[PDB]
Amino acid sequence: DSFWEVGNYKRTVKRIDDGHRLCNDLMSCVQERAKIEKAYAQQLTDWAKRWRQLIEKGPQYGSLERAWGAMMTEADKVSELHQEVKNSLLNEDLEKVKNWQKDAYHKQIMGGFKETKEAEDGFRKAQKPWAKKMKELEAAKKAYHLACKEERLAMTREMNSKTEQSVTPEQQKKLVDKVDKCRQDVQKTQEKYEKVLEDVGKTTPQYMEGMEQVFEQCQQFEEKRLVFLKEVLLDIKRHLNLAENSSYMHVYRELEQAIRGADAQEDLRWFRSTSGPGMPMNWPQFEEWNP
Amino acid sequence: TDSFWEVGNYKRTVKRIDDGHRLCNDLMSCVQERAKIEKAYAQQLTDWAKRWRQLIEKGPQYGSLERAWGAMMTEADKVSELHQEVKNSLLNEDLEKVKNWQKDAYHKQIMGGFKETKEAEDGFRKAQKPWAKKMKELEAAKKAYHLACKEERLAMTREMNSKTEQSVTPEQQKKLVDKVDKCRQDVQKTQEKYEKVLEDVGKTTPQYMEGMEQVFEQCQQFEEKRLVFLKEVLLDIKRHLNLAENSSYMHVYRELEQAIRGADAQEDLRWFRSTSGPGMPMNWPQFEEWNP
Predict the structure, then answer these.
(1) Considering the domain B1-279, what is its CATH architecture?
(2) Which fold has domain A1-278?
(3) Which residues form the F-BAR domain (chain B)?
(4) Which residues of A touch B57 (CB under 8 A)?
(5) How far apart are the CA of B110 and the nearest CA of chain A, in angstroms?
(6) Measured between beta carbons, which residues in chain A are less than 8 angstroms from residue B245?
């Protein structure tokens, strides 16, 4: 199953098609993740809107009302941050992959791709003379062996031509003439087989150089891809990670400050003055007769 | 008036006792609904990781870039785990903390209301009862006095113009003169009485006031407990929601980055060369003799 056997360069060529398919998959992968980020964010938004309305119009009041209110703003801020992840995934990373793919893989009539075609033809071309020589080698080999077999038979007849009932002088001469015909053919076919072998030996460096050049062109093209995708994977790491800058942290700094700011006594004193003993009052006094 | 000190306007202080129980219910509903959102996100991350871990591990992406890309399914799973913790902490720690507190602070009586609400009702009601009675007396005395002045105007104005009249009999006049004598006397004792009830309202105002302040202060202290607790539970919730300062959240993305940075394009290229390329071994042709 060696690369060096006729045909087995295909594996390298399939890699070029696979590269394209891998870009698609990666784009689909980040798109689906963007979707998941958008869902989470919208649900945080809904909750925020829902509970900000229920807290406002509900009986909670004062600084504790606002403290509880502060939860809805963290949800909005966290929603916003996950919408930014979504935006980055789609607008930067996905697009970066989409565009690299466009400049790297050019479709033919009739696909698949020119890049796969080039490599195919390259490998075919580099291997054509070799392949032909290998067929000739195989023909010369069997030819040689068919001579070696026929000689062993012609000889095997000489063994039992000595001790067999009917053996005339005419055939005993023709039998010896036969083995010399075989021997001369074993030689003729051995020379041709040896000659093809020699040709195969002289051709081999060029066969190798040619294939190794096409292969290296494939290796280089794959490298552009592996280097690009590693960079894209870093882009995605950084866009997924909300700890990449301090905005995420500040969301919770602010939340905690709003909560700690809430004061029970302040709220109490407010209720006192607006609904309690702290309210002013017109105390009874003498009222004269009207009008 | 809307003033607290008017009879019955203490009711808003009482209503606020009922409101606190309802406020707890809202908080629990609020944290429940949040935990559902954390769960939903955590599950969707889990489904994405599972799906794409398979899609990758089903070829043709190989080598270290396969691992780097797969490390992304690991961050999805580990972040999912973190949002499940958030959910669990919200439900099992915070919601339970609130539910327990509600249970120990509020007690339902046989018909509808909370014991704590009925105690404030009765407390105010008791503290206001004498005053409520004096204000009815004060209203009644005020009516009587005004009605006595109105009756004085009828009798007095009826005398002023009956002086210059054609058929001025001496009785009345006389009985019309004696009708104002009565009305004047009605005004004196009715005004006296109104002045007396008004003196009494004044002198008892401080005792009415301090009695109401005592019952209100008990309400303040009960509300204060709700507010102090509520502030603490909100801090609890904040600590649980906060993944930003969480070291495991930080670690997830350091781990993802290390995986990606570990990817090695050349290593992957050598490997392909060795296992599929011109580095593969080869039995090159040689002279083969005849068999067997």
Answers:
(1) Up-down Bundle (1.20)
(2) Substrate Binding Domain Of Dnak; Chain:A; Domain 2 (1.20.1270)
(3) 1-268
(4) none
(5) 25
(6) 249, 252
